[PDB]
Each structure stands twice: as C-alpha cells, then as structure tokens.
Design a protein around this ligand. Structure first.
Ligand SMILES: *[C@@H]1O[C@H](CO)[C@@H](O[C@@H]2O[C@H](CO)[C@@H](O)[C@H](O)[C@H]2NC(C)=O)[C@H](O)[C@H]1NC(C)=O
Ligand SMILES: *[C@@H]1O[C@H](CO)[C@@H](O[C@@H]2O[C@H](CO)[C@@H](O)[C@H](O)[C@H]2NC(C)=O)[C@H](O)[C@H]1NC(C)=O
Ligand SMILES: *[C@@H]1O[C@H](CO)[C@@H](O[C@@H]2O[C@H](CO)[C@@H](O)[C@H](O)[C@H]2NC(C)=O)[C@H](O)[C@H]1NC(C)=O
Ligand SMILES: *[C@@H]1O[C@H](CO)[C@@H](O[C@@H]2O[C@H](CO)[C@@H](O)[C@H](O)[C@H]2NC(C)=O)[C@H](O)[C@H]1NC(C)=O
Ligand SMILES: *[C@@H]1O[C@H](CO)[C@@H](O[C@@H]2O[C@H](CO)[C@@H](O)[C@H](O)[C@H]2NC(C)=O)[C@H](O)[C@H]1NC(C)=O
Ligand SMILES: *[C@@H]1O[C@H](CO)[C@@H](O[C@@H]2O[C@H](CO)[C@@H](O)[C@H](O)[C@H]2NC(C)=O)[C@H](O)[C@H]1NC(C)=O
Ligand SMILES: *[C@@H]1O[C@H](CO)[C@@H](O[C@@H]2O[C@H](CO)[C@@H](O)[C@H](O)[C@H]2NC(C)=O)[C@H](O)[C@H]1NC(C)=O
Ligand SMILES: *[C@@H]1O[C@H](CO)[C@@H](O[C@@H]2O[C@H](CO)[C@@H](O)[C@H](O)[C@H]2NC(C)=O)[C@H](O)[C@H]1NC(C)=O
Ligand SMILES: *[C@@H]1O[C@H](CO)[C@@H](O[C@@H]2O[C@H](CO)[C@@H](O)[C@H](O)[C@H]2NC(C)=O)[C@H](O)[C@H]1NC(C)=O
Ligand SMILES: *[C@@H]1O[C@H](CO)[C@@H](O[C@@H]2O[C@H](CO)[C@@H](O)[C@H](O)[C@H]2NC(C)=O)[C@H](O)[C@H]1NC(C)=O
Ligand SMILES: *[C@@H]1O[C@H](CO)[C@@H](O[C@@H]2O[C@H](CO)[C@@H](O)[C@H](O)[C@H]2NC(C)=O)[C@H](O)[C@H]1NC(C)=O
Ligand SMILES: *[C@@H]1O[C@H](CO)[C@@H](O[C@@H]2O[C@H](CO)[C@@H](O)[C@H](O)[C@H]2NC(C)=O)[C@H](O)[C@H]1NC(C)=O
Ligand SMILES: *[C@@H]1O[C@H](CO)[C@@H](O[C@@H]2O[C@H](CO)[C@@H](O)[C@H](O)[C@H]2NC(C)=O)[C@H](O)[C@H]1NC(C)=O
Ligand SMILES: *[C@@H]1O[C@H](CO)[C@@H](O[C@@H]2O[C@H](CO)[C@@H](O)[C@H](O)[C@H]2NC(C)=O)[C@H](O)[C@H]1NC(C)=O
Ligand SMILES: *[C@@H]1O[C@H](CO)[C@@H](O[C@@H]2O[C@H](CO)[C@@H](O)[C@H](O)[C@H]2NC(C)=O)[C@H](O)[C@H]1NC(C)=O
Ligand SMILES: *[C@@H]1O[C@H](CO)[C@@H](O[C@@H]2O[C@H](CO)[C@@H](O)[C@H](O)[C@H]2NC(C)=O)[C@H](O)[C@H]1NC(C)=O
Ligand SMILES: *[C@@H]1O[C@H](CO)[C@@H](O[C@@H]2O[C@H](CO)[C@@H](O)[C@H](O)[C@H]2NC(C)=O)[C@H](O)[C@H]1NC(C)=O
Ligand SMILES: *[C@@H]1O[C@H](CO)[C@@H](O[C@@H]2O[C@H](CO)[C@@H](O)[C@H](O)[C@H]2NC(C)=O)[C@H](O)[C@H]1NC(C)=O
Ligand SMILES: *[C@@H]1O[C@H](CO)[C@@H](O)[C@H](O)[C@H]1NC(C)=O
Ligand SMILES: *[C@@H]1O[C@H](CO)[C@@H](O)[C@H](O)[C@H]1NC(C)=O
Ligand SMILES: *[C@@H]1O[C@H](CO)[C@@H](O)[C@H](O)[C@H]1NC(C)=O
Ligand SMILES: *[C@@H]1O[C@H](CO)[C@@H](O)[C@H](O)[C@H]1NC(C)=O
Ligand SMILES: *[C@@H]1O[C@H](CO)[C@@H](O)[C@H](O)[C@H]1NC(C)=O
Ligand SMILES: *[C@@H]1O[C@H](CO)[C@@H](O)[C@H](O)[C@H]1NC(C)=O
Lengths: 147, 170, 147, 170, 147, 170
C-alpha cells in the first residue's frame, strides 16, 4: 500500500533512529481502529509527494483537501476530539507506545499515549491495556509458531 | 520489560517535516495561535484591544485565503454581519468583535469560540459540577492576520484542519 | 472507549433490567459492521453529556451535528435505508437479539431484529443466522478455552 | 434455547432519554409527523387544506430554524420559488403546495416526497409489478409548524436527521 | 446483505459464465479493504433496482447521489486515485484475480489486477502476493477442516 | 496453478449494464471524453478552436444539468467570471477558455485541468525528475456539449462521478 518499510531519523523526534517490522505495515492496510496507521499513511504520502513533485503550496493544499479522507481517519479524529471535550484522556497524535520482541524484533501495533490536563498518562494508569496486548500478542505468536 | 520477554518503549513523532504538503494548527500559549502551511502562516491573536473599526467588509496568496474561508464558513449560523471587520489590502487582517450586544452559548461569542475550539482543540480556553457546552473566554477580540512562519510553536499536524474540513456548513 | 459497562433499567423498554458482558463492549471499539455498537455509542455519548454539561438544546444540536459521524455509522444507516426502500426486511434500530451462555453469561454481539411490512420478522425466518452465530460462538468459546 | 446451552432472548431499546442531546424523527400516523429536539418540536402535517396563500416569503429559537433549514436544503434541485409559502412571525409555519402545475417524480411533488421520505423513512406514503421510484401521495399540501412536544409518538432517534444531514446539497 | 449468490453471463465480459462460492459473499458484509466487495455491492444494487422500479434516469441519479457512500468505498477510491496520481500501479476496477480450489470450489476474495502505463501488471510482478494469499488460504482451509 | 492445488484465474467485469442506474465517465482518446447516464450523454471535447464568443452567461433534462452543475462546482476557487461561455438554449454547450491571461497551476487552466483530472482520472493529459502537480495541456479550449450516447467508449462506471461528488466545494 506504500506510495513510495520503517521510519528514519528525521521522523523520530526523541531517539536517533527506530523503526518497526513487516507485521505493522502489513496490518495498516486501510485500518481505522488505530491512529498509528493514520500517522504512517500521512508520512508515506508526504514522502511520496516530496520525491515526485516540485514544491508548491497551493497545489499541495488542494490535493490534501481533495484526498483528506484517504489519509486521516475521520471518525477516529472525531472520537479523540470528543474525548478531549469531556475532560477525558485523549490521543493528540504525538506519542505512541508498543511492545516488541527482544530478539526477533516482533513488534505490535503502537497504541497512542493518552494525554490529559496537558500531561501524558502515567504508565500505571493503562497497565491493564499493556498486559492485555502482551497476552494477545503472545497468543498470536504461539499460533504463528504452530501453523 | 513485560512478561520477561518483550520490552516496553515509546515512539515520539516530529511534525516539522509535515509542512510542505500538510497544514499545521497549534497554539503557542493562551493568547496566540498559529496555522502554517509551507512557508505561509496565519496568526490568530486573542488581544483585548481592537485595531480596526470599519465594522463592514466585502469578502470579494490563495492558500491563506482558502484557510481563512474554511475557518469563516466553519462558524455556523449567522455571523450577524456587524461583528466582523476586514482588511484584505496589503495583507489579510480579519477582526471578530466577540462581545455581548447565562446561556453564554447562544451569542456570537459562543459560536466563534466553537470554531476556534474545533480548529485548535480544547486544551486552552476550555472549562472543566456541570460546565456549559461552549468554551469560555475573558477577552473581547479575535484578530487573524498573516505572519511569515518562523517556527513559533511545536508542529502539531493537519488534524485540526481536518476537523475544520469535516465540520463545515452544518 | 467509554466517555463516562452494561445497560440499566431506563434504557431497556421491555424488561426491568438486563445487560451484557465485557466481550461486546470490547468488540465495539470503532465497529461498523453492527448496529448494536452504534446504539451503545449513542447511549454512552448521551450519558457522558448529561453528567458533565448543563442542559442546552442549541449547543447539544451543534455538537451532534459536528460529531454525527463519530457516533452513527453512516454506511450502515444508508444500507438499512436502501433495504427499507425496496420492500426488503431492514433494521429500524428498535429490537436486537443475541445468544448468551446459561451460566457464565458469555454473550454475543446482538444482531438487529429485521422488520418488514410494519412487523418484526418471525423467529423461523432467520433461524439459519441464529444457528450460524451459535456455531461460530461455540468455536470461539472452545478456542478461548484451549489457549 | 439453542444447542441446549445458549438461550435466545432479545433487547428492546427506549429512545425517550435520547432527547436532550439528540433529535428525534417519527410519524404518529399517515397524516402527522414530528421532529423533536429536547423540549422543542416541529409538526409536519399532511393536510389537504391550505391555510396560507402568500406564495412569497423571505428566508431572512435557533434549533428549530436549523432543523427547518436542513430539511429545506435537503429538497434538491429547484424549489420553483412559487410553491412555498412562509410565516416566520410569532412562530414558524412553512407550507408546501405539492400539486401539479405519468413520471410523477419530475415534479415538485416528487422531490418534496423524496425529502419527506428520506427524513422519515419509507414506512408510510410508500408504494410496494414495477413501482415508480418517488413516493406516492393523495394530499396536496404539506405544513411544517412548531409544536411544544408532548410525547405524541414513540421516540425513534436521530437516524432520520442523520440521513438528512448526509443527503444535503447533492 | 443481498438486496435482491454468484455472477452470471452478462456481468462477465471475457468468459461465458463464472461465479464464486458463499465465503466471498459472506465476507463482503460491509468490507472496505477490498474493491471486489464494492463491485458486488454495485452489481447487487443495479440488479435490485432494475427488477423493482420502472426505468427513470433522474430518479436513479438522485438515489445514487443520496446513497453513493452506501455502495462505493470512498477511501479505497481515493487511495486508488492517489496511486494513479504518482506513477504507481493502481486499481481501475476492471480486472480481478483470485485462487480457487480445484475440486470443492473454495474461492478466495479476488484482488484487483493493478494497471500502470495503460497496461496490466505482469503475473511475475505480484507473484509474492499470490503466494502469500495461497499460504493464508491454505491455513484457513486446514483450520476449517480441524474445527 | 499454484501450490499444485489451487488454480490462478482472473475476473473481467462489464460495465455496459451499469447504465440505467449509474453514471459512466470515460475517455475515447486524448481529445474526447464522455459522461453517460442512461440514454443521456455529455461530450467533453478538447478542441483547439472556439465556437462561442459571448464570454458572459447566466446559470439560471435535469440529469445532464445536475452532472454539469456537479462538474462546475467541482472547479474550486474563483472561475474569474470571464473565462466561461454558455449556451443553454436548444441544448447545453459550455466553453472554457483555458488560456493564460512556470507555476502553471495557479492559473484557471490549472484548476480546470484539476477538475477534468479528478473526474476522468490521470491516464490522459498527465505528466510523469520532478513534475508539477496540476496536469499539463497543449490545447486552449474545453467544450462540454450534450450528445445522445451511442457506445463511443468502453463503459467505466460511476467511480469518476463519485470522486467528483466527494471533491465538491472544498
Ligand atoms: C519543512 O519540511 C522540509 C521537508 O520536509 C524540511 O526541509 C528539510 O530540511 C532538512 C534540514 O534542513 C534537510 O536535511 C532536508 O533535505 C530538507 N528536505 C527537503 C525535502 O527539502 C524543512 O526543514 C522543514 N522546515 C522546518 C522549519 O522544519
Ligand atoms: C505567548 O507567546 C507569544 C509569542 O509566542 C508572546 O508574544 C511575545 O511577547 C513578547 C513580550 O511580551 C514580545 O517581545 C514578542 O515580540 C511577542 N511575540 C510575538 C510573536 O508577537 C506572548 O507574550 C505570550 N503570551 C504570554 C501570556 O506569555
Ligand atoms: C464591538 O461591539 C461593541 C458593543 O456591541 C462596540 O462598543 C460600542 O462602541 C460604540 C462606538 O464607540 C460606543 O458608542 C458604544 O457605547 C459601545 N458599546 C455598545 C454596547 O454599543 C464596539 O465598538 C464593537 N467593536 C468595534 C471594533 O467596533
Ligand atoms: C502579510 O502580507 C503582506 C502582503 O503580502 C505583507 O506585506 C509585504 O511585506 C513585505 C515584507 O518585506 C514587503 O516587502 C512588501 O512591500 C509588503 N507589501 C506587499 C507585498 O504588498 C506583510 O508583511 C505580511 N505580514 C507579515 C506580518 O509579514
Ligand atoms: C478585556 O477588557 C475588558 C474591558 O471591558 C475587561 O472586562 C471584561 O470584559 C469581558 C469581555 O466580555 C467580560 O466578559 C468580563 O466580565 C469583563 N470583566 C472581567 C473582570 O473580566 C477584561 O478584564 C479584559 N481582559 C483582560 C484579560 O485584561
Ligand atoms: C501532545 O501532548 C503532549 C503532552 O502535553 C505535548 O507535549 C508538550 O508539548 C509542549 C509544546 O507543544 C511542551 O511545552 C510541553 O513541555 C510538552 N509536554 C510534555 C509532558 O512533554 C505535545 O506537544 C502534544 N502534541 C501535539 C501535536 O499537540
Ligand atoms: C428526556 O430525557 C431526560 C433525560 O434523558 C428525562 O429526564 C429524566 O426523567 C426521569 C423520570 O422522570 C428521571 O428519573 C431522571 O432523573 C431524568 N433525567 C435527567 C437527566 O433529568 C426526561 O424524562 C425525558 N423526557 C421524556 C418526555 O421522556
Ligand atoms: C393522527 O394522529 C393525530 C395526533 O396524533 C390525530 O390528530 C388528532 O385528531 C383528533 C380528532 O381528529 C383531535 O381531537 C386531536 O386534537 C388531534 N391531535 C393533534 C395533535 O392535532 C389524527 O386524527 C390522526 N390521524 C388519523 C387518520 O387517525
Ligand atoms: C397551489 O397551486 C395550485 C395550482 O398550481 C393553485 O391553484 C390555483 O389557485 C388560483 C388562485 O385561487 C386559481 O385561480 C387557479 O384556478 C388554481 N389552479 C391552477 C391550476 O392554477 C393554488 O392556489 C396553490 N396554492 C396556494 C396556497 O396558493
Ligand atoms: C410556536 O412558537 C410561537 C412563538 O414562540 C408560540 O407563540 C407563543 O405561545 C406562547 C404560549 O403561551 C404565548 O405565551 C406567546 O405569547 C406566543 N408568542 C410569542 C412568544 O411571540 C407558539 O405557541 C408556538 N406554537 C405552538 C403550537 O405552541
Ligand atoms: C385532496 O383534495 C382534493 C381536491 O382536489 C381531492 O382530489 C385529489 O387531488 C389530488 C392532489 O394531487 C390528486 O392527485 C387526485 O387525483 C385527486 N383525486 C383523488 C380521488 O384523490 C383529494 O381526494 C383530496 N384527498 C383526500 C384524502 O381527501
Ligand atoms: C421499529 O419497528 C417496529 C415494528 O413495527 C415498531 O414497533 C411498532 O411501534 C409502533 C409505534 O412506534 C406501535 O404502534 C406498534 O404496535 C409496534 N409494533 C410492534 C409489532 O411491536 C417500532 O416502534 C419501530 N421503532 C422505531 C424506532 O421506528
Ligand atoms: C443498458 O443496460 C440495460 C440493462 O442493464 C441493457 O438492456 C439489456 O439488454 C440486453 C441485450 O439487449 C437484454 O437481454 C436485457 O434484457 C436488457 N435488460 C433490461 C433490463 O432491459 C442495455 O443493453 C444497456 N445498454 C447498452 C448500450 O449496453
Ligand atoms: C478520438 O475519437 C473521436 C470519436 O471517438 C474521433 O472523432 C471522430 O473523428 C472522425 C475523423 O476525424 C470523424 O469522422 C468522426 O465523426 C469523429 N467522431 C465524433 C464522435 O466526433 C477523434 O478523431 C479521435 N481522436 C484522435 C486523435 O484520433
Ligand atoms: C480567451 O482568452 C484569450 C486571451 O485572454 C482571448 O484572446 C483575445 O481575444 C481578443 C478578442 O478577439 C483579442 O483582441 C486579443 O488580442 C486576444 N488576446 C488577449 C491576450 O487578450 C480570447 O478571445 C478568449 N476566448 C474567447 C472565446 O473569447
Ligand atoms: C442536445 O439537446 C438538444 C435539445 O434537447 C437537441 O436538439 C434537438 O434535437 C432533436 C433531434 O432530432 C430535434 O428533433 C429537436 O428539434 C432539437 N431541439 C429541441 C428539442 O429543442 C440536440 O440534438 C442535442 N444534441 C445532440 C448532439 O444530439
Ligand atoms: C492550439 O493552438 C495554438 C495557437 O496558439 C498553438 O499554440 C500553443 O498554444 C498553447 C495554448 O496554451 C500554448 O500553451 C503553447 O505554448 C502554444 N504552442 C505550442 C507549440 O503548443 C497550439 O500548438 C495548438 N495546439 C495543437 C495541438 O494544434
Ligand atoms: C482498466 O485498465 C485496462 C488496462 O489498460 C483497460 O483495458 C484497456 O481498455 C481500452 C479501452 O477501454 C482498450 O483499448 C485497451 O486495449 C485495453 N487494454 C488492455 C491491455 O486490455 C480497461 O479498459 C480499464 N478499465 C476501465 C474501467 O477504465
Ligand atoms: C508517574 O510516573 C513517574 C515516572 O517518573 C513515576 O515515578 C511515578 O511513580 C508515577 N506515579 C503514579 C501515581 O503512577
Ligand atoms: C471592496 O473590496 C476592495 C478590495 O478588497 C476594497 O478595496 C474596498 O474598499 C472594498 N469596499 C468597501 C466599500 O470597503
Ligand atoms: C410466527 O411467530 C409466532 C409467535 O407467536 C408463531 O406462533 C408462529 O408459528 C410463527 N409463524 C411462522 C410462519 O413462522
Ligand atoms: C421579510 O421578513 C420579515 C421578517 O420575517 C417579515 O416581517 C416581512 O414581511 C418579510 N417581507 C415580505 C415582503 O413579506
Ligand atoms: C509478461 O507476461 C507475458 C504473458 O504473455 C510473458 O510472456 C512475459 O514473459 C512476461 N514478462 C515479464 C517481464 O514478466
Ligand atoms: C439568461 O438566460 C436565458 C435562458 O437561458 C437566456 O435566453 C438569456 O439570453 C440569458 N441572458 C443573457 C443576458 O444572455
């Protein structure tokens, strides 16, 4: 589905360079239950547009307005808005957290790091989600080992 | 580390490179807000002083004009035709008057805060015991001008502009 | 995904009180192949809005119009419309039917009760769907028992 | 019971509490239809008698006006400018004239039935041997007035209003 | 989900008649990661509209405009557009390819045949996708045999 | 055959029967393009000669008029009010003037190519070393007329019209 795979130095703000495996990109094929897939789509569109078209602000804005639905999940954006509205921890598209295998690099789909009152949620607030994702990922891993 | 096998770590995204192809919508602080597309920018300042007193303007680069038209059309209902002042000469400068002529939402202030709100999120100027729907403000002016982007805030992304695009003429 | 979990007395019209397990709410995380998830989203939004905001008709209508896509599945609504159009049994969002475990309360995702000619479909018209759902639910149950 | 283990049972939802935050769109019977948001209501009656004969009106609470504007904009095409009568004084009263000036769809009646249709579903005033697309009606008037909601019908939900919102200006 | 199942002679342009099994139609229940499901929805809508309504151009156009989202996946259409935009092999909704069982007729979901430079992609360009689909289909088949 | 068990074969769809209920948008060649709904058709020709010189027209069957209005509203921005000529008498004939009064996109040609582009795809009149965004053209006229469909091209489907519907007034 790539218009131009894992991230590079300039896309990551904190570390020098980190990137993912094939399972995440293979799962983000029109996937709109997750925000990381939308981020990957945005980055891919930017990379493909910069390497094929000369710089132009008006034309880029026009093409974004025409194909905004093809990149950003509308309903995820509006739900995250609604969460921000009612004093509820929401996703502001900055920080994503995931679990990866120590050796084979088997990564999962990064969940968004919720933010509330202008501050990221503590690790102990969503530990249950981390445990559930670890469990389902280990079940998927054993199923893939069996086949 | 979790379960003794997998390791917990986070990703942090930088939106500085998502500039030449995508709009960016942010706030430096409670006062100032910015909308930057490429090398072009719009500054939304919540001054408590007015600079224009025309109270009459005719809507008659293209990028900033399209962003401004999206923002204006995203104020829904009737703009009362007497609370907006315009200066499209030698730059774009639009001033909203944002004053009362306990609902606090049925007025023009309520809807203008609703459009600012829906463009920039609810981190600033938000309330929150039951709190009214529309956002609350202590200023009485909103000036949107053009400013040549100089990396004033931290880049956010086109998500606010997408919310503006979806919530247009409803 | 809750903005404020199972139903209560005032939400159910027929019985005094009934509600579901964790699997249904965990499956209705941006799920738009089913109408029950949209109903749950609507009820959750109403409950969260009533407990945090003072009553206001105009503002509530504005917020609903802005975030209508975040709650009601547009395409499901239009397909149910198209079904109503051509003299076909459709879903009018009133009655939902499901199967639950007798002891452990393992519930499924309630399918909509189709209506035609101003009357609900008889139980014998969609018995095949009930049998198929029972089969797939029992397979999922045995798979979860295995793990 | 099914398969000797699981039990068959149904859910029935009540939409009475989905009133202060969501619109409601229903029909009491073949004649009367209602659109209620909170404590505000609009009555759409299919009378066969007319009450207004102005045949000219200027489109110049906010909730009922927004519902009415959504309904009017959702009649697509051209309203012929001479089949609508208005009375926005001391209440909102809009009368559609719904009469011929075998297609039965290319007329103003066809499109007005299409908008009523798409707001309220096809349970009433619907046909259904091949049947024409647009709905069929034996009346020649459609009056939309304001009425203080008194639980006239069974609450339905905001699904009809959502269909109106999606099918707007197409 | 049918408003009126497998294809017939007049819908297929190349061969005299071919059609699919129950798994594909059962999987195309509001499925918008694939273009074949959108094609099936379009064909079903046309078949159901022709057999219940008299011919009328204006009314058909009106009903299509009202319920365009209920039939054609908007985001798939815009992604295929974006692929066409940047000199990338895209789907133009003409040719679809799939794998079926030799004896029991167990068919898969037909993937779109990508086109670039006004010509269909060669079979050797997307052989990896064919192998991956064969592998996952055989795993699904063995899982269904086990149950 | 693949894996010795499953057989590789393809499907080819015919869009001829998707005609009475769905629009069709295609191009016969570089010059001519067609939009056919049922038995009604519109021919978009890229002639290099002009046939109308009014340079002033008043926008005041319904199917072709709705297709034309969708196409016209899908040219975004300002049409300059002096580059369109109209002839709605005894047929529909609209001529776009498509000439300069290195960006090549900020002009009226850029946006008119953008609307043609987004209706008909990018197989013809497309570029593609960095290439400009908007499409490139060597003609200086675009005439949209009505033509009684006679199966000029191969049927494509309503996908182009759907893209037009989505990208309207943005
Ligand atoms: C706007 O984005 C562009 C491209 O995304 C950035 O330009 C890059 O700048 C870095 C560092 O100066 C160079 O190494 C790259 O080669 C540039 N890329 C391109 C495509 O020109 C630019 O820095 C961004 N602007 C800001 C203020 O961050
Ligand atoms: C919010 O930030 C803006 C700029 O990011 C601040 O405005 C600056 O104010 C200082 C001193 O008041 C001036 O020297 C600068 O020229 C201003 N910058 C701009 C871009 O106008 C503003 O003061 C900040 N607000 C608060 C409350 O701290
Ligand atoms: C914003 O509106 C306020 C109040 O509606 C205006 O304030 C009035 O200004 C006039 C002219 O100076 C005074 O005579 C009035 O006494 C003021 N108050 C009221 C209640 O009318 C204000 O002028 C408007 N803003 C601008 C920039 O014109
Ligand atoms: C807003 O835009 C106007 C017009 O584009 C800018 O005014 C120009 O500023 C440049 C900067 O050196 C001058 O050289 C021009 O003479 C100005 N006038 C023009 C082009 O008509 C204005 O600077 C912009 N605003 C800001 C804050 O930069
Ligand atoms: C803005 O200037 C005014 C001058 O009237 C100050 O008064 C407030 O004006 C707002 C405008 O709607 C009213 O809602 C408030 O009730 C007024 N009083 C207060 C105490 O806020 C106002 O203080 C000014 N704001 C600032 C931050 O300096
Ligand atoms: C998402 O939310 C986080 C959490 O507040 C933001 O991080 C803050 O960013 C501001 C400037 O943008 C800094 O001054 C703060 O120090 C940051 N806080 C922390 C705890 O790191 C982040 O910028 C937000 N991202 C977007 C795109 O809005
Ligand atoms: C409109 O909805 C509201 C809230 O959903 C209903 O008010 C509730 O009324 C019941 C019974 O009178 C009380 O027990 C609740 O406490 C009320 N809730 C709130 C939030 O006030 C109201 O009854 C509904 N109107 C109708 C006509 O059914
Ligand atoms: C449809 O229902 C409406 C009201 O729900 C009926 O109108 C009532 O008619 C009776 C006697 O005809 C009057 O006393 C009431 O005042 C009317 N109610 C309202 C709200 O106007 C109407 O008669 C019903 N139609 C049919 C055909 O039975
Ligand atoms: C609705 O339209 C009908 C027919 O178009 C109008 O009926 C005409 O009324 C005038 C004025 O009384 C008569 O002279 C005509 O004979 C009637 N028939 C026709 C065919 O013109 C009717 O008046 C309109 N409704 C309203 C409320 O004015
Ligand atoms: C439609 O709305 C109008 C105006 O809001 C209502 O007219 C008012 O009715 C109340 C009821 O007691 C009177 O006290 C007012 O004097 C009326 N006029 C006004 C406010 O200008 C009218 O009643 C509504 N329609 C219905 C059927 O209730
Ligand atoms: C409505 O009143 C009229 C008076 O002309 C009756 O006549 C019908 O009018 C409709 C309006 O378009 C025509 O389509 C019908 O052909 C007319 N005839 C019949 C038999 O319906 C009409 O009967 C009235 N309706 C009722 C229910 O009383
Ligand atoms: C969904 O359809 C059912 C089936 O007709 C509706 O149930 C009827 O409701 C009406 C009033 O709304 C009653 O008079 C009937 O007796 C009911 N019929 C049966 C068989 O129970 C139900 O109301 C519809 N729901 C919505 C929201 O439209
Ligand atoms: C337009 O589509 C219609 C129906 O999809 C086609 O009419 C069919 O024509 C075939 C062959 O002539 C007949 O066997 C069918 O019975 C017709 N179907 C119907 C519903 O009338 C028509 O041929 C298509 N037009 C073109 C030019 O291909
Ligand atoms: C593109 O096709 C059109 C028609 O499909 C061609 O126009 C035809 O041209 C011939 C000779 O030039 C005329 O006899 C026909 O009457 C034309 N047909 C129509 C429908 O106008 C056109 O020549 C083709 N273009 C190219 C470059 O080959
Ligand atoms: C399309 O625009 C061009 C240029 O804008 C027009 O060409 C001009 O035509 C007039 C009248 O014949 C001449 O006097 C000018 O010299 C031409 N060139 C320019 C640069 O103005 C052309 O007329 C327009 N098309 C139509 C059909 O009117
Ligand atoms: C475009 O439409 C016009 C008007 O509908 C067509 O002009 C008619 O053509 C028929 C064909 O025989 C004549 O009988 C009529 O007298 C014409 N005029 C009318 C109805 O006012 C025109 O033919 C259409 N264009 C094409 C290329 O067929
Ligand atoms: C179209 O006719 C013109 C007469 O001026 C020829 O000239 C081209 O006009 C276009 C219109 O914008 C310019 O962009 C080109 O630069 C002009 N020159 C060339 C060489 O294309 C033009 O050649 C004509 N086209 C054809 C295909 O015959
Ligand atoms: C999808 O793309 C294919 C590949 O180009 C198209 O097939 C061509 O169709 C044209 C006319 O439409 C023929 O002249 C070519 O010979 C065909 N090429 C091949 C390789 O078969 C197909 O028509 C396109 N379909 C749509 C709906 O646009
Ligand atoms: C919050 O996170 C910090 C990380 O430094 C940790 O030290 C602290 O204990 C956490 N607090 C809670 C309440 O989870
Ligand atoms: C109309 O707009 C023009 C151009 O922006 C401006 O110069 C003029 O002053 C405006 N008219 C009035 C009456 O202000
Ligand atoms: C319809 O349902 C009723 C429920 O009381 C049952 O008695 C009856 O046999 C059913 N009829 C058919 C044809 O399924
Ligand atoms: C214009 O609207 C006003 C307010 O609704 C109304 O009083 C007036 O009668 C209308 N004009 C005409 C000519 O009817
Ligand atoms: C392209 O496909 C044709 C089918 O006839 C085949 O003969 C040829 O070898 C293929 N070429 C490549 C490069 O895959
Ligand atoms: C206005 O439109 C009519 C009908 O299309 C047309 O006859 C008339 O010429 C137009 N007006 C002008 C000034 O061209």
């Amino acid at each position: 589905w790539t218009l131009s795979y894992c991230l590079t130095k300039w896309m990551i703000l904190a570390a020098e360079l980190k990137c993912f495996g094939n399972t995440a990109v293979a799962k983000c094929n029109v996937n709109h239950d997750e925000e990381f897939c939308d981020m990957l789509r945005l980055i891919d569109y930017n990379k493909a547009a910069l390497s094929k078209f000369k710089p132009d602000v008006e034309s880029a804005l026009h093409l974004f307005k025409t194909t905004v639905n093809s990149l950003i999940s509308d309903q995820l954006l509006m739900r995250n808005h609604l969460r921000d509205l009612m004093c509820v921890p929401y996703c502001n598209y900055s920080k994503f957290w995931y679990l990866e295998h120590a050796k084979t690099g088997e990564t999962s789909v990064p969940k968004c790091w919720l933010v509330t009152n202008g501050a990221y949620l503590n690790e102990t607030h969503f530990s249950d989600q981390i445990e559930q994702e670890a469990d389902n990922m280990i079940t998927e891993m054993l199923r893939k080992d069996y086949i | 580390i979790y379960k003794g096998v997998y390791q917990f770590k986070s990703v942090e995204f930088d939106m500085s490179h998502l500039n030449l192809t995508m709009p960016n919508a942010c706030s430096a602080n409670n006062s100032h807000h910015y909308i930057s597309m490429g090398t072009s920018g719009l500054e939304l300042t919540f001054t408590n002083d007015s600079i224009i007193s025309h109270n009459f303007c005719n809507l008659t680069d293209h990028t900033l004009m399209s962003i401004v038209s999206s923002l204006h059309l995203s104020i829904r209902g009737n703009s009362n035709y007497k609370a907006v002042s315009c200066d499209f000469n030698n730059g774009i400068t639009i001033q909203y008057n944002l004053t009362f002529s306990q609902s606090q939402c049925r007025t023009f202030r309520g809807r203008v805060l609703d459009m600012f709100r829906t463009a920039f999120g609810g981190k600033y100027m938000r309330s929150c015991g039951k709190t009214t729907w529309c956002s609350q403000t202590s200023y009485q002016y909103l000036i949107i001008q053009n400013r040549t982007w100089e990396n004033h805030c931290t880049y956010a992304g086109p998500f606010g502009m997408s919310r503006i695009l979806l919530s247009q003429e409803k």
